Amino acid sequence: GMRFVVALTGASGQILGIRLIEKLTELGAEVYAVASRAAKITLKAETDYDEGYVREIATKYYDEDEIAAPFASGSFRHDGMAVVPCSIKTASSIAYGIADNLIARAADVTLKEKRRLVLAIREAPLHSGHLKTLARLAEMGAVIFPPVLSFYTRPKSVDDLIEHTVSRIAEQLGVEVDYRRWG
Amino acid sequence: GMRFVVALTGASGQILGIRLIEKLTELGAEVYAVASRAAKITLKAETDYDEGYVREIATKYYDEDEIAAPFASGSFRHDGMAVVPCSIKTASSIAYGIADNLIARAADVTLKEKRRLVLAIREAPLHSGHLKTLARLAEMGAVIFPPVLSFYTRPKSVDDLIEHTVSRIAEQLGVEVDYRRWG
Amino acid sequence: GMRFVVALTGASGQILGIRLIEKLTELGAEVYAVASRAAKITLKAETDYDEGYVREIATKYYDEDEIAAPFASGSFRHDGMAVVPCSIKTASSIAYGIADNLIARAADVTLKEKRRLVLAIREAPLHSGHLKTLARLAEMGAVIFPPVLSFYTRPKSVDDLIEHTVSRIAEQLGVEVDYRRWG
Amino acid sequence: GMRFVVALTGASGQILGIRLIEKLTELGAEVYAVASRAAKITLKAETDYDEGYVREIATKYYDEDEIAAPFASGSFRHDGMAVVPCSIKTASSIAYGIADNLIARAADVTLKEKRRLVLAIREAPLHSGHLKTLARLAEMGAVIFPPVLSFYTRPKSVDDLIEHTVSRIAEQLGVEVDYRRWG
Amino acid sequence: GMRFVVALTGASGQILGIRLIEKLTELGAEVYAVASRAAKITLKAETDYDEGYVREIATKYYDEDEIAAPFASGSFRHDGMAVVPCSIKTASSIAYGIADNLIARAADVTLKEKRRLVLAIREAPLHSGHLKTLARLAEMGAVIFPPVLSFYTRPKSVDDLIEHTVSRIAEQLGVEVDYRRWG
Amino acid sequence: GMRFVVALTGASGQILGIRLIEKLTELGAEVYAVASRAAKITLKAETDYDEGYVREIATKYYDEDEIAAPFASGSFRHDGMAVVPCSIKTASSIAYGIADNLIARAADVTLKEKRRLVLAIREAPLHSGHLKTLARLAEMGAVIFPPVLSFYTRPKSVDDLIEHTVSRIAEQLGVEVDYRRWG
Amino acid sequence: GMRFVVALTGASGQILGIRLIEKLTELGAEVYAVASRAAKITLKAETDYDEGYVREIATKYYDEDEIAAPFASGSFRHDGMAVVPCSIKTASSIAYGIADNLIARAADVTLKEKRRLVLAIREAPLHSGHLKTLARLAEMGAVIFPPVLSFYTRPKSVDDLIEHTVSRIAEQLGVEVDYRRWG
Amino acid sequence: GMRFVVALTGASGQILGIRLIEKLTELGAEVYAVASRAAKITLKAETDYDEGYVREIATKYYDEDEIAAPFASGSFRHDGMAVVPCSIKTASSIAYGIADNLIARAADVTLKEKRRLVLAIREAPLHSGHLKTLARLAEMGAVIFPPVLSFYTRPKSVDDLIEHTVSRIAEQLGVEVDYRRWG
Amino acid sequence: GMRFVVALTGASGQILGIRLIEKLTELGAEVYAVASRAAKITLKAETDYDEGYVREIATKYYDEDEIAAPFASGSFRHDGMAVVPCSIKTASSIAYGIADNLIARAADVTLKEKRRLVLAIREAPLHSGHLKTLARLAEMGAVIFPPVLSFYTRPKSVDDLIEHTVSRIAEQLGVEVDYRRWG
Numbered sequence A, B, C, D, E, F, G, H, I: 001g002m003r004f005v006v007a008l009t010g011a012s013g014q015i016l017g018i019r020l021i022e023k024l025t026e027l028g029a030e031v032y033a034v035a036s037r038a039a040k041i042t043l044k045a046e047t048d049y050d051e052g053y054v055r056e057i058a059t060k061y062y063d064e065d066e067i068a069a070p071f072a073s074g075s076f077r078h079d080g081m082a083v084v085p086c087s088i089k090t091a092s093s094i095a096y097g098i099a100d101n102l103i104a105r106a107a108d109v110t111l112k113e114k115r116r117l118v119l120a121i122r123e124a125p126l127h128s129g130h131l132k133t134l135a136r137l138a139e140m141g142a143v144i145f146p147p148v149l150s151f152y153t154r155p156k157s158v159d160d161l162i163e164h165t166v167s168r169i170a171e172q173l174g175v176e177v178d179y180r181r182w183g
């Protein structure tokens, strides 16, 4: 019984976090989901998905102000956290300890207990301040995963690209996943 | 009359560099194109595009061993260079001065003459060694542009995503471009 | 048609940002204005200016929670941003990527697209943590402009000092301005 | 007449800040107290203390949003500030200048005026990002005081341990205190 | 059959290392114990525990001068090492390679073979030299665990606090432990 | 079924990589082997081993120009990579991202996916540039293993020394191995 | 009997390396010469010198792929190495250990054995990446000698300038040379 | 109407600054010239040029003690500054803010207003202290241009070499210049 | 008459230091020998050599507590020092100035007087803390010589390998030695 935290933050690519939650659920893991306010605004602008769809597919759902949620403490056990998509604001809050909501605090707790943390950073260009922040995060142990376009799987629709990226992110959580791979 | 260097290297996303060459050509700029050996191998694996298609659409074409090409010198004038897609190997060669082919040397010449250089870095995850390299490149003046998935334009096919990313890369070259933007 | 973002934050010197908006408007530029909550509190404590005066003189006005404003995306074009006056909190939020309101996000977008950003940092003393933060911002490309007393123009009232400083800040935005200068 | 700021933040150990306020009050100093929202949530979870008990024992009480409180300016005189207990979020906000509430701003003002600041950092483990943050704070002049278990005083109850730690923290404020010490 | 090294050094909190040895023994692991000279002096000052009690409860006991003990070589297999409590002197000896007794050498061997090392650093305040040392240790892979007071488990005696801290340290060794946790 | 990449590069000690391949094969793992051009030149100068012996004992063999080999992508799964012996050129290519052949690219892919990478660096003296490079590699997660003479196993021939070193390198891959160890 | 390695690389100023070889030969030293492929291309573009002239005047000549040449090992004795002219690519390959041809490997061997290495770096402008590379090389012990125009010797032809620069480079090899000097 | 500051300092190569002033004057720009005391001493030792020749060809001339000259203030507008030739002393004074004469102050003013500054650094060898200084200057935005010998234009006299170098320096000022270039 | 200090410390490879003493004695130099306590323990475990054999073959012998030995002062002249084999503990003591015995103090005196110091560091793996320590030592001027296996001399017994390594270490002391070398 593996349990994972998945957080959606206010960057483009809300569909990536929704699909990661669906895949991890499919594979029989529990997912504790958190969506920030900005992620809900982006979901509205970006998709037609029901505003309560994330709460629907998650094992348990928390809003970003639920700072007393169970995984706000390192004494609560789980197997890893993914922030997908991850804004610069959340990546930077984690990097520098500005743990002022449940998402940043849960990620900080993941890092201090040396559990796996995967950040699907979505921003471009990245300036030297961003890059130093990501380097600091990498030093702290986080997996830095820009959700880059990939074509070696020969994708034909947007869902093809989403599936490849979501699969590759799941592997960063230490998950055996079935998907097209390079041969 | 604006002239730009566009280099394709051995990362996934060959279509991005092809389409950037087409767009810049459409807008009436000259494009001096270079494709590395690994980029030609990737083009073959990734697309069905004619092996000589890049040479076709470019104003002038060079192979990566043409180390005496005109823009290998800073005394030759041009308005900027883009490496799309950019492998870790080429980004790192530029960062550390291992200018052992035309692509890395042309980018180094672009940087030392303080012209615009845009690197469409495609790799994920990025480890701390990659991130320090990109930070060094940013300090040298390069634009670091991971070709990240974007959805706020509400894309419906793969060509939609390619067009947004290619447009955003063109803007990093100081180019006025017409495309859907955030409102 | 040049467009500029001007943000007021919670430091003393609200009059400096008001007057910069008036000058840029005088010269025929559009100004997109943002005032933080703390800046509105300071305006009340510091001036007798109408609480809606900034909205009056601006081309378009946004509150700091309007995180979906047009210049929250790099695909929206403008010619530069000034934060006048700039608190330590906002300068530091920009430096470290804590882009949790429209002001910090707009400034981050200005920086990543290599547009001009001018920060009228008002704090004294500056401790070593402040100075490292400002050095980081300078490395990212921001103009660091403490609004220092100046006397070589032989000022005779408070408005004289404000005019010199506002003029010098406008020049950091790449603006031709008419004012008394050193001969 | 010595005056001290004491701030409680959202880490375990609310009793430590309550008892420091009582001791400083006992010794005839004035205490200006601030409790963050998260500290009030923790107090509720951790103790049975009256929700208004801190306001009761303090000379003057402020909530964390009272950003215009007197010690938000360096022109207001006081003799030092202690944050007890201090969360990672508040320590990091101080370190990097994210002075977005009264607690972080008051501590920043304490530091820039070279007054004494004592941070009772309570977190374990501390990862390399935390440690770099604390090192930065130490460079800025803050006293870093993890509220560690101590046994050389031969404590027999929880109140014994609290008294030793609160006494040692008071000494970091430059306070003569009477307590059991090593001989 | 899991085997762990537990070292006691000359900081207050000898009871923490004794209790960790008891817990790991309870759970059926072997414990190879080492106590430094200063730890024996502190045990005498701090407790009433028999001077040979550590040797009693350990699977095998070594004094700090037994520099040829089996785990002084990386070719000897074990599952992790904890130094509880850890003095500044021992943490710093490990950080900088001054491996002049069995404790520092065993910890260095743990680190170079990328096994788990947990350091229950007990000192307060920590000055900037201490913090840089701990940051270096964190970079080398050590878990830095100040044995901080914790109250969210609502402890009622000194043994309550010791049990929480010892449990949390055991978890840093990768040990499944049964104890009260945050909900 | 565990699979490992083993690469031979152009440093003295070709026998070490041959014997590691034999041991891993003996223990029932698959080995994907790569030998650089310089390693083949060194093999000829150093041994009498058949030029195709490495291809013989490997599960699958690749030359260093086979940049499209399966483990050039992180989507291909394996359990670790060893470069034995490792030249300064290959260690430095990995450190700085100059991933211009299959060996450096495979090692970079191993690192970015946080798999185990062991580098049997053979050079002496090591100057400060080498040492900074190895420190960077260590930060990226690589195991740095100079193949140093060892005598505590009381070796009597050259094969004794090779067996100890090859065994110790195998352990860095997370392999249970049977060999003489310190007692 | 003093022996020196002189390498020509692909920067302008091939005449400088030819003349250094002639001078050292004149003074009765042996010169082991290496010319890279790019240096041969530059010689053709830059001079009318016979393509085999360098091999003619050298004691022994090697091409850059002769990676098994005697001075590829530190056990081979010589008195110093000069790279004249030195490209950014070769200087950077030496700095970062990318010793992928005889020139970079011979220079690395010179450095690790603490012999004299003189690099006649010819590039302008030098960007911050170049300057950090040269600083690293200087730390490793290399002499950094940009072949700058000099006029205090009152030169009257191009050969006058070449003679001054070649003489000054020879002195960096620890060679007594007769030439016009400042008085 | 473009205006440029050109400063001559006490390094060999006075002819380079004289010729740059002539070229910029030829092209119809105004040149504000400054010569240091050491540059006048070098001019005397190096050339036969009239001691007042620089004042003759300049639009306006200043001695280095004219610290109140117009471009000692950022409020005075100009289009860039070149120091040709630039001594280590002047480059270092600019780098570290020792702005104790008009040349260093004018260059500092050029940098703080983000105008173009080109430093024709003439010294060889450059030790690690020089290289760190130049790297700092590059970070501040200065163009670092060692006046290196160049031969790809196939120069035949000293004036040929001077013309190439002066032309290349003019291009660093953002000047369209007509000269032989690489093809 | 050349005099050299040779120190044996508590790492495997005692035979290397014995043989270096024999070779230097053979060549007619004086050797002042020091063996640490741990080196004597290792000699016993590792060899059958007489416990007083080192004292026998040395010109003069000192134990590590003879802190007043002649070469504990820089005013005593000698030609270099080798620590063979060198433990991490001794290398680190030298690096950081923990000069608490004759070996570390003699090496520190060697370094401050800019005499040659060669450290035959024997440890593997080397973690990032070790590598930073060795880099610091290299910066201080020490020769870092891991006693790596070497095969290009085509060794046939253990004594063959020892002779090559001892010869190469002697060369780092500036000693002309006769041994098989690369051709």
Ligand SMILES: Cc1cc2c3c(c1C)C(C)(C)CC=[N+]3c1c([nH]c(=O)[nH]c1=O)N2C[C@H](O)[C@H](O)[C@H](O)COP(=O)(O)O
Pocket: A008, A009, A010, A011, A012, A036, A037, A038, A039, A041, A042, A045, A086, A087, A088, A089, A090, A122, A123, B152, B182, C067, C068, C072, C073, C099, C100, C101, C105
């Ligand atoms: C409303 C909004 C916010 C964007 C945004 C967009 C919009 C509409 C888009 C979709 C229009 C284009 C881009 N966005 C990104 C972005 N931040 C970021 O780092 N990456 C992004 O891709 N932001 C900023 C982000 O939402 C703010 O920085 C929030 O404070 C982030 O807070 P959070 O991490 O807690 O969700």
Ligand SMILES: Cc1cc2c3c(c1C)C(C)(C)CC=[N+]3c1c([nH]c(=O)[nH]c1=O)N2C[C@H](O)[C@H](O)[C@H](O)COP(=O)(O)O
Pocket: A152, A182, B008, B009, B010, B011, B012, B036, B037, B038, B039, B041, B042, B045, B086, B087, B088, B089, B090, B122, B123, F067, F068, F072, F073, F099, F100, F101, F105
């Ligand atoms: C053949 C090949 C090379 C991939 C590659 C792929 C293949 C088939 C894919 C498409 C299968 C999956 C990924 N690839 C990337 C990659 N390098 C990189 O940094 N990003 C990539 O996305 N590489 C490595 C790259 O081609 C080598 O590092 C080259 O030496 C790069 O040289 P270049 O910059 O001169 O083109």
Ligand SMILES: Cc1cc2c3c(c1C)C(C)(C)CC=[N+]3c1c([nH]c(=O)[nH]c1=O)N2C[C@H](O)[C@H](O)[C@H](O)COP(=O)(O)O
Pocket: C008, C009, C010, C011, C012, C036, C037, C038, C039, C041, C042, C045, C086, C087, C088, C089, C090, C122, C123, D067, D068, D072, D073, D099, D100, D101, D105
């Ligand atoms: C209410 C308030 C806030 C002052 C302040 C004052 C008051 C009354 C004064 C006018 C009384 C004296 C000084 N002030 C400054 C200050 N922050 C700063 O860096 N520089 C200042 O000059 N602050 C702090 C500031 O408003 C808080 O740090 C906000 O969180 C800043 O948030 P903002 O950047 O989003 O506006």
Ligand SMILES: Cc1cc2c3c(c1C)C(C)(C)CC=[N+]3c1c([nH]c(=O)[nH]c1=O)N2C[C@H](O)[C@H](O)[C@H](O)COP(=O)(O)O
Pocket: A067, A068, A072, A073, A099, A100, A101, A105, D008, D009, D010, D011, D012, D036, D037, D038, D039, D041, D042, D045, D086, D087, D088, D089, D090, D122, D123, E152, E182
């Ligand atoms: C609700 C809550 C928050 C804990 C917390 C706990 C709970 C219930 C406990 C008591 C259950 C276990 C641990 N806690 C700590 C913690 N932050 C920290 O650095 N140290 C802590 O000891 N946090 C996080 C903290 O409250 C958030 O990071 C706040 O944003 C801090 O904001 P503040 O500094 O303004 O109070």
Ligand SMILES: Cc1cc2c3c(c1C)C(C)(C)CC=[N+]3c1c([nH]c(=O)[nH]c1=O)N2C[C@H](O)[C@H](O)[C@H](O)COP(=O)(O)O
Pocket: D152, D182, E008, E009, E010, E011, E012, E036, E037, E038, E039, E041, E042, E045, E086, E087, E088, E089, E090, E122, E123
């Ligand atoms: C005797 C003694 C030593 C204390 C000490 C105390 C005493 C009596 C107390 C209990 C009275 C109060 C504090 N102590 C600590 C301390 N070192 C440290 O970093 N943390 C401590 O908590 N020390 C110092 C320590 O014992 C010396 O630094 C030893 O050299 C440590 O050596 P070790 O790591 O090998 O045991």
Ligand SMILES: Cc1cc2c3c(c1C)C(C)(C)CC=[N+]3c1c([nH]c(=O)[nH]c1=O)N2C[C@H](O)[C@H](O)[C@H](O)COP(=O)(O)O
Pocket: F008, F009, F010, F011, F012, F036, F037, F038, F039, F041, F042, F045, F086, F087, F088, F089, F090, F122, F123, G067, G068, G072, G073, G099, G100, G101, G105, I152, I182
């Ligand atoms: C031919 C050759 C190359 C030696 C070498 C030798 C020879 C004959 C010896 C065996 C004679 C003595 C030493 N060697 C080493 C060496 N590089 C290194 O870092 N460590 C070595 O031990 N090199 C250099 C190496 O082969 C070149 O640097 C290659 O470019 C390395 O490329 P590779 O990593 O792709 O194999």
Ligand SMILES: Cc1cc2c3c(c1C)C(C)(C)CC=[N+]3c1c([nH]c(=O)[nH]c1=O)N2C[C@H](O)[C@H](O)[C@H](O)COP(=O)(O)O
Pocket: B067, B068, B072, B073, B099, B100, B101, B105, G008, G009, G010, G011, G012, G036, G037, G038, G039, G041, G042, G045, G086, G087, G088, G089, G090, G122, G123, H152, H182
């Ligand atoms: C063909 C060629 C290459 C120039 C060059 C020129 C040409 C024609 C000139 C003569 C036209 C103008 C300038 N050049 C220089 C240059 N590299 C450099 O750092 N400094 C130079 O002065 N290069 C680049 C160089 O040759 C490539 O970077 C090679 O990969 C260097 O490889 P090498 O060090 O092994 O010779």
Ligand SMILES: Cc1cc2c3c(c1C)C(C)(C)CC=[N+]3c1c([nH]c(=O)[nH]c1=O)N2C[C@H](O)[C@H](O)[C@H](O)COP(=O)(O)O
Pocket: G152, G182, H008, H009, H010, H011, H012, H036, H037, H038, H039, H041, H042, H045, H086, H087, H088, H089, H090, H122, H123
């Ligand atoms: C008199 C004098 C000064 C030389 C000099 C020469 C002479 C005669 C030469 C022409 C004989 C050979 C070299 N010179 C250089 C030099 N400084 C430097 O960095 N590069 C040089 O090329 N100097 C030093 C320089 O003039 C002093 O450092 C001044 O203080 C520089 O001050 P300035 O920048 O204000 O002019």
Ligand SMILES: Cc1cc2c3c(c1C)C(C)(C)CC=[N+]3c1c([nH]c(=O)[nH]c1=O)N2C[C@H](O)[C@H](O)[C@H](O)COP(=O)(O)O
Pocket: E067, E068, E072, E073, E099, E100, E101, E105, F152, F182, I008, I009, I010, I011, I012, I036, I037, I038, I039, I041, I042, I045, I086, I087, I088, I089, I090, I122, I123
């Ligand atoms: C007893 C002993 C100590 C080994 C050791 C061995 C044994 C038996 C072996 C031979 C069994 C395996 C490895 N050893 C090494 C080692 N230290 C080190 O850095 N490299 C080594 O190769 N050590 C540690 C060393 O002796 C201690 O760190 C001493 O404090 C070093 O002190 P010294 O430098 O003053 O001699």
